[PDB]
C-alpha cells in the first residue's frame, strides 16, 4: 500500500543514479559544445528524479471519478514530461542544427501533447478522456514525423558520426514515445485493463530508457564534441 511504490522507488534510484553520473562526467568536460549537451541531458533525469520522489512519498496523486469508480491518477508524471520532453527534443535539434521555427513548432506541439494528455487524465466523462488522448497522440505523431523525415534530412548534411548518433537516438525515441499512448490507453487512465502497479512498472521502464538510456547513448558519443 500503495502497491506501485516498489517501481516508484526503483525509478527514483535509477533517475538519481543517472543524474549523478551525468553530472560527474559533465563537470569534467572542457569542450563548450559538449557542455550544452551535458547540461540539457543532466536536467532530464534530475526533473524525473524530483517527480518520482514526490510520487513515492505520496504527492501528485488525485482521484478522478469516471466509469462509476474513483480512479487514482498520478498527475505529477505530466509536470515531469512537460519539461523533460522538450529538453530531449532540444538535444536532438541541437545535434542536427534544426532551425528556430522547427524547434518552436516541436516544443509547441510537445506542450499540446502533454497538456491535452493531462486534461484527458482528469476528465470525468469517460468518453471525452479518449477525445483528449486522440488530440495528444496526433500532436505526438506530428513530432515523430518531423524527427523522422525532417531531422534525418538535416542530419545527413552533418559528418557521418553525427548522423549515425542521430539515427540511433531518433530510433530509440520513435520506439519509446510510441508506446506511451498505448500504456495510457490500456492502463488506469483509459480502459483500465492493466492495473496501476503493472502500468507504473511500464512507465518506469519507458522513462528510464527514454531519459537515462537516451543520455548514455548521446553523452558517450563523439558527436557532441
Ligand atoms: C503521517 C505518516 C505519513 C508518512 C510517514 C508516510 C506517507 C508516505 C509513506 C511512504 C510511502 O508510502 C512509500 C513507502 C511504502 C513502504 O510500504 C514503507 C516505506 C515508505 C517509504 C512509506 C513510509 C511512510 O509510511 C510514509 C513516508
Ligand atoms: C521522459 C519521458 C518521456 C520521453 C515521455 C514521453 C511521453 C509521451 C510521448 C507521452 C505521450 C502521451 C500521449 C501521446 C497520449 C496520451 C498522454 C501521454 C502524455 C501518455
Ligand atoms: C517493507 C518496507 C520496505 C521499506 C524500504 C523503503 C526504501 C525505499 C526507498 C529507497 C530506494 C532505493 C531502494 C531500491 C528499491 C527497493
Ligand atoms: C507532405 C505530405 C504530407 C503527408 C502527411 C502524413 C501525415 C501522417 C503521419 C503520422 C505518422 C508519422 C510517424 C513517423 C514515422 C516514425
Ligand atoms: C543537482 C543537479 C544539477 C543538474 C543541473 C546541471 C545543468 C544546469 C545548468 C544551467 C546553466 C548553466
Ligand atoms: C509548421 C506547422 C506548424 C504546426 C503546429 C503544431 C501542430 C500540432 C498538431 C495538431 C494537434 C491537434
Ligand atoms: C527493469 C525492471 C525489471 C522488470 C521486472 C520484470 C517483471 C515481473 C514483475 C511482475 C509484476 C509484479
Ligand atoms: C543530484 C540530485 C538533485 C535533485 C534534488 C532536488 C530535491 C527537491 C525535492 C522537492
Ligand atoms: C492523425 C495524425 C495527424 C498528424 C499530422 C502530421 C502532419 C505532418 C506534417 C506535414
Ligand atoms: C544500432 C541500433 C539502432 C536501432 C535501435 C532500435 C532499438 C530501440 C530500443 C528499444
Ligand atoms: C502490453 C503489456 C500488457 C501486459 C499487462 C497485461 C496483464 C494484466 C494483468 C491482469
Ligand atoms: C534501449 C536502452 C538503451 C541502452 C543504452 C545503453 C548503451 C550505451 C552504450 C553505447
Ligand atoms: C508554431 C510556430 C511555427 C513557426 C514556423 C516554422 C514552421 C516550420 C516547420
Ligand atoms: C483544441 C481543440 C479543442 C477540442 C475540445 C473538444 C472537447 C470535447 C468536450
Ligand atoms: C514496453 C515497451 C518495450 C520496451 C523496450 C525497451 C527496453 C529496453
Ligand atoms: C562505480 C562504477 C561506475 C564507473 C564509472 C567510472 C569510475
UniProtKB/Swiss-Prot annotation:
GO molecular function terms listed in the Swiss-Prot or TrEMBL record: light-driven active monoatomic ion transmembrane transporter activity; monoatomic ion channel activity; photoreceptor activity
Entry's Gene Ontology cellular component terms: plasma membrane
Stretches that traverse the bilayer: 5-24, 39-57, 75-91, 103-122, 130-149, 168-186, 199-218
Lineage, top ranks: Archaea, Methanobacteriati, Methanobacteriota, Stenosarchaea group, Halobacteria
The protein's name in its UniProt record: Bacteriorhodopsin
SUPFAM superfamilies for the chain: Family A G protein-coupled receptor-like (SSF81321)
Extracellular side: 58-74, 123-129, 187-198
UniProt KW Glycoprotein keyword: no
Amino acid at each position: 500500500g500503495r502497491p506501485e511504490w516498489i517501481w516508484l522507488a526503483l525509478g527514483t534510484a535509477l533517475m538519481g543514479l543517472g543524474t549523478l553520473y551525468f553530472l560527474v562526467k559533465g563537470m569534467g568536460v572542457s569542450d563548450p559544445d559538449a557542455k550544452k549537451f551535458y547540461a540539457i541531458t543532466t536536467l532530464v533525469p534530475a526533473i524525473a528524479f524530483t517527480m518520482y520522489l514526490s510520487m513515492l512519498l505520496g504527492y501528485g496523486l488525485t482521484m478522478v471519478p469516471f466509469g462509476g469508480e474513483q480512479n487514482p491518477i498520478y498527475w505529477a508524471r505530466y509536470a515531469d514530461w512537460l519539461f523533460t520532453t522538450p529538453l530531449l527534443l532540444l538535444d536532438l535539434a541541437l545535434l542536427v542544427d534544426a532551425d528556430q521555427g522547427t524547434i518552436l513548432a516541436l516544443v509547441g506541439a510537445d506542450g499540446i501533447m502533454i497538456g491535452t494528455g493531462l486534461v484527458g487524465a482528469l476528465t470525468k466523462v469517460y468518453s471525452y478522456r479518449f477525445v483528449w488522448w486522440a488530440i495528444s497522440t496526433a500532436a505526438m505523431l506530428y513530432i515523430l514525423y518531423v524527427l523522422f523525415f525532417g531531422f534525418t534530412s538535416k542530419a545527413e548534411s552533418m559528418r557521418p558520426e553525427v548522423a549515425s548518433t542521430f539515427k540511433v537516438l531518433r530510433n530509440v525515441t520513435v520506439v519509446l514515445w510510441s508506446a506511451y499512448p498505448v500504456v495510457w490507453l490500456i492502463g488506469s487512465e483509459g480502459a483500465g485493463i492493466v492495473p496501476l502497479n503493472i502500468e507504473t512498472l511500464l512507465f518506469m521502464v519507458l522513462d528510464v530508457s527514454a531519459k537515462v538510456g537516451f543520455g548514455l547513448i548521446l553523452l558517450r558519443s563523439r558527436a557532441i564534441f
